[PDB]
Amino acid sequence: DRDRLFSVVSRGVPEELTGLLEYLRWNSKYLTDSAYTEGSTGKTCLMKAVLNLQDGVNACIMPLLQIDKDSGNPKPLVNAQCIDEFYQGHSALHIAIEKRSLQCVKLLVENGADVHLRACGRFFQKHQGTCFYFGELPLSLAACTKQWDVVTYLLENPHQPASLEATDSLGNTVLHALVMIADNSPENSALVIHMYDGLLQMGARLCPTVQLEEISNHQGLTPLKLAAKEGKIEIFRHILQREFSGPYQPLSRKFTEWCYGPVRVSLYDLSSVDSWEKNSVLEIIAFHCKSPNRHRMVVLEPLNKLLQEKWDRLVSRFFFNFACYLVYMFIFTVVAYHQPFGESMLLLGHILILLGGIYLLLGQLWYFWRRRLFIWISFMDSYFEILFLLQALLTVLSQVLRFMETEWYLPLLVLSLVLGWLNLLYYTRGFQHTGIYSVMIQKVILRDLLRFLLVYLVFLFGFAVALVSLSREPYRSILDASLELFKFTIGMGELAFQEQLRFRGVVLLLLLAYVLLTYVLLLNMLIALMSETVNHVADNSWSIWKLQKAISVLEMENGYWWCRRKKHREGRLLKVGTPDERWCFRVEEVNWAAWEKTL
Amino acid sequence: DNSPENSALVIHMYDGLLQMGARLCPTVQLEEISNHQGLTPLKLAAKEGKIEIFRHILQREFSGPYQPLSRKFTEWCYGPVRVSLYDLSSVDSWEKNSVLEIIAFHCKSPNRHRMVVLEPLNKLLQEKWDRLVSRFFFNFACYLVYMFIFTVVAYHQPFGESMLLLGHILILLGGIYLLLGQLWYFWRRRLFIWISFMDSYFEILFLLQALLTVLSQVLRFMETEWYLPLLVLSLVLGWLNLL
Amino acid sequence: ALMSETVNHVADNSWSIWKLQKAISVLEMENGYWWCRRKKHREGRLLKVGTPDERWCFRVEEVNWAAWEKTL
Structure with a gap:
């Protein structure tokens, strides 16, 4: 293939004469096929052709189209030679849309564009080492690069549009790609939010039949859940409380419905409700998330009021459990101190202590079984919990050593006692501001x-x-x-x-x-x-306290293992109008800027 | 000097003078001339502690006919990530008096700690650390087991007699090895200790410990009763130096 | 006091001091143990690379979104 090596110039008659003289190497493409692989050049000819990079404007006169017409081989795929030459998972469409050139992609789509480029590789990081993760889709890369024109052209191609609900090998859609390229830098945050709203509007205009945000990746996460897990705040906050006016109103999440004065009520739609559905956003932020700024992700607006309501509902059971634990520890201390009608009291106290130790051990085991992923990743976030298990274990162990009639049970019983008295401090996570300095x-x-x-x-x-x-x-x-x-x-x-x-x-x-x-x-x-x-102490302490309260209320909402797993009642506010009926949550907030802006 | 006006003046004059030298006398490289101390302008900026001019020279980029004069090379960019090909004369490689050791040892500016975190030096040092962490941990483990042996020998000091004598021999060998290593380090860095040794005072402590250890064994070979205080002082100094 | x-x-000085200590340590251990003489000073980072002047360089990949908001 001497044409590729002799195509150093932008365009001219040498390319035409070379193509005419070659013509499929005179019906014998043996050397052409040999040079089409790696070694002869090391990179595909289209790649070198498309970055001529003219100072004025990128031309479209290079022979890329008539050479494709001449190459009527059963493999007209516009890809990289040998599928991977340090650029595994890269094709001609990706580099073409990288250059922000409309002409190349416009003329190439009518050919074998072959959208949904599920390429092999997946080496190094994500898909490729020096290739940042953009979703391995043409429209995904186009949206990630802030190029409205190419995205619009791909979504309504004259021959066949590129489906917006397309997925890669990982399971991501374009929205998930935007979520993972949504670093908290202000420029990137603005770019991703603008592209996200524009893409939602385009999807509504083109394919309103299917909801775009309900597609989950292979991990089973919606873009909102993905933003929650990855720790992105700006895009997650925007998606949580995005409002639209006009034909795009159904796409919105909040609803500024009524305002009798400076106070206005916002009807936040929530897919983060536990209700009867699992893998909610609340538990994703509480358990699965590992970002250092996740404590700020539960204090935005709807989640803050939601957690406040849940805490106010469950504080009764929280204090009841605290009182039960306190009386259990009082009984344990009395039994330990008075240990050598009275004999009956001592034996019933020992039986009660054994029962309580068994109950706490079983509860901790059930908690660990239900949260195997959290302990598998990192259990240091809620280390207090594991301490409880230890205490319970020792208590049971002590009674075992008591049932063997040995002299070694006393150290184990006393270690339990002191560990339980230390673990009584676990209940300071509630109360009031007194815990703010005690959680950090x-x-x-x-x-x-x-x-x-x-x-x-x-x-x-x-x-x-x-x-x-x-x-x-x-x-x-x-x-x-x-x-x-x-x-x-x-x-x-x-x-x-x-x-x-x-x-x-x-x-x-x-x-x-x-x-x-x-x-x-x-x-x-x-x-x-x-x-x-x-x-x-500026704002981190309050966020940490709110995060601990959220974890506690989520844990106690599941119910005691003795009571099975209750029924998961209390659908907050249930159904409410705005033909789509979705559950929401009403929050009344006071703001005087509305009247100084909206006359 | 790091004043913004002087920094702007010197950077502008430096780039203009490089361009003029390239236009007039491109045959000889202007930045390769060293003063009587044997320092290039980059090395001079490193030693004197200037940051602005040193940072600019380290990562100066030019477009057009002046591109060869540039140091970095923003060559490829597949997306938001772009690769910069920083040219480096600060590499140790097979050449001595590199910029890295100039900043590490010969420099005495109070802001020299900021001079190794700019961009190319930071990644360079990260790569070197990742390459040498294996030997670092191996040396740490060897020192830890040596101190464990020393503590055992000191504590159990009045088949067992053979163990005690081999332990004493190993302790003497380790003390001699550390003493010789510290002496070699001091000989190789005579200028640093001549100027100021307080920057890495921990190192000298090692020497002291080693010396005492050897001294203890000397006092042990004289069959005197005074070897125990020296041995114990070594032991405690080594346990302190484990930090 | x-x-x-x-x-x-604690704004940025501590990290710079830590990096300086790490640099001193890696420079010291790179010379090799005196028992092993002074090794051979291997590991020329990235060796020669194109750009008629061939000079050794070091490649660093950095992410910046300001390029696309400036270079359209």
Whole structure:
């Protein structure tokens, strides 16, 4: 194929004469087919042809169409040679629509355009390494690049339109591609929101029969659910409360229906309601989402009021469970303290403790079984919960060791007791503003104190071994020396025993060194703790508290395992008018800017 | 100087002078002439701590006839992602006195920490770290097991006699190895310690520990009673230096 | 005194200092162990690449949406 190697110029008579002289290499395409693969050039000839990149305007006079007409082979597919040359999953249509050139795609579609390009590869990341994820569809890439003209042409092609509900190998549609290219940068957010609304309007105008937002990918997520999971805020917020006026009103989600004054009622349509449907947006944000800004995703407007209503409805059961746990712990403390008519009371108390431990263990096991994905990904977000399980286990274990008539049951019983008293703090997540500062501590303390305590224990054990080495030839065992070093920070074991084999001075110097290391570690503790406090109390704490409340209300809404899984009642506001009847939720908000804008 | 007016003046004059030199004398590269200290203008900017001119020289791009004078190359862009082909004279490779070590060691500016996070140096250092993290963790594990052996020997010090003597031999060998390594490091970086060694004071601590260890064994080979304080001081210094 | 230089220290200085320490460490260990002499100083990053001047370079892929909102 000498034509491709000799097509360095834009266009001219050399291409025409080469094509006329070749004519399917004179009915023998052996060398033409050999050069059509990789090695001869390494890239497809169309790719090199389409980026002539003229300064004035990209021409359409290059021979790409008459060479295609001449190449009447059973494979007229406009793809990359050998299907993958460092560009797996790339075709001529993608590069053609990349250049923002209307002429090339306009003249190419009438040929074997072969839309729905489900190509092989899927290597490196997503589909290709240096290829950003755009959906592996022509119209998806066209929409992702903010090119209205090519999208419009593809959606109403004269020969065959490209279906808007098309899907790739991953299962995404074009909307999902926009969702995953919806990074929170203001320019990208504006681009994606504009393209999303425009594409919804185009789909309504062309194919109103099928709802575009109800198509789920292979993971089973709608674009709203996808935005919730991926942690995108701008596009998720827009989709949650998008309003349209005129013929596009049914496509809208909220409904500013009534306004008797500065207060106006918005009728937010919600597909995030739990109701009798699973995989709701609320649990997606609560459990499946892993973005660092997910705490802000439950305080926008409709979700905030929704969670407030759910909390106000379930606070009765929350306090009832808190009281039951408190009385159970009181009974457990009494039984542990009074453990050697009275014998009957002691035995019934032991039976009640065993029953409570079994109940908590079974509840924690059911919770873990129902949330296997959350623990599989990361269980550190709700570590308190696992603590409950541990406590329950120990309690049961204690009773087991009690039923074996052994002497070792008491440490297990006491460890349960102290773990349960520690876990009673779990119920501070509710109440009031008093929890605001008590919910953000567990996300930085557990990260800092762990490493700093590891370092402190390493230093303490080293110093203890050193003191044992001095005292060998008064710090007899390693445990005793470690205990002494732990006491030195506050209570000391100092004033060395006179003549300590002429090594009193080095021992005193080592003790002073340990004191300085402990003190400087404490100062580092304070500095590290205070470092992430100034930029944490603006709005993050309230968002974290709301997220914890949402997780708690979602967990308790499922009902106690003893009560099976109730019936999932309380469809909020049920059906309401606006021929589409969908459930909504009414929120009254006061704003005086309406009257200063809408005269 | 990093003042915005002076930075703009110097960058404009620098690009204009490069263009004039290319137009008049393209035979010889202007940026390859080194002063008596042996520093190119890029290396000079790295050492003196200037950021604006150094950043500009590191990633200056030109279009047209001045394209060869440019350093980066925005060559390909398949979408929002574009690939920049940063030319680098800061590569260690087989050449000495690279820009990386100039910023790391010879530079003394208070803002030098910002000079390794611009764009090309940041990714370059990330790649080097990802390549050398294997050896870093291997050395960390070797040091940890050496300190475990040292702690065991110190604690159990009065088949067992053979274990104790081989442990003492291993401790002496490790102390000698660390001492020699620290001496080699100091010899290779005599200028850094001559100017200021307080930037990497941890390193000198290692030397001290090693020295004490060897000293302890020396006092052990003299059959004296004073070796134990030196051995214990080494031990605690090594446990501190594990940080 | 300890808290005085903490408020104006955690914006970007800490990350720069950490990167500087990592750079110093990787430069030091790249020379190789003295027992292994000074190795051979391998790993020329990306080696030679086109653009009659052939010079070694390093490729970095960066994402920016401002290009399409500026370069139509």
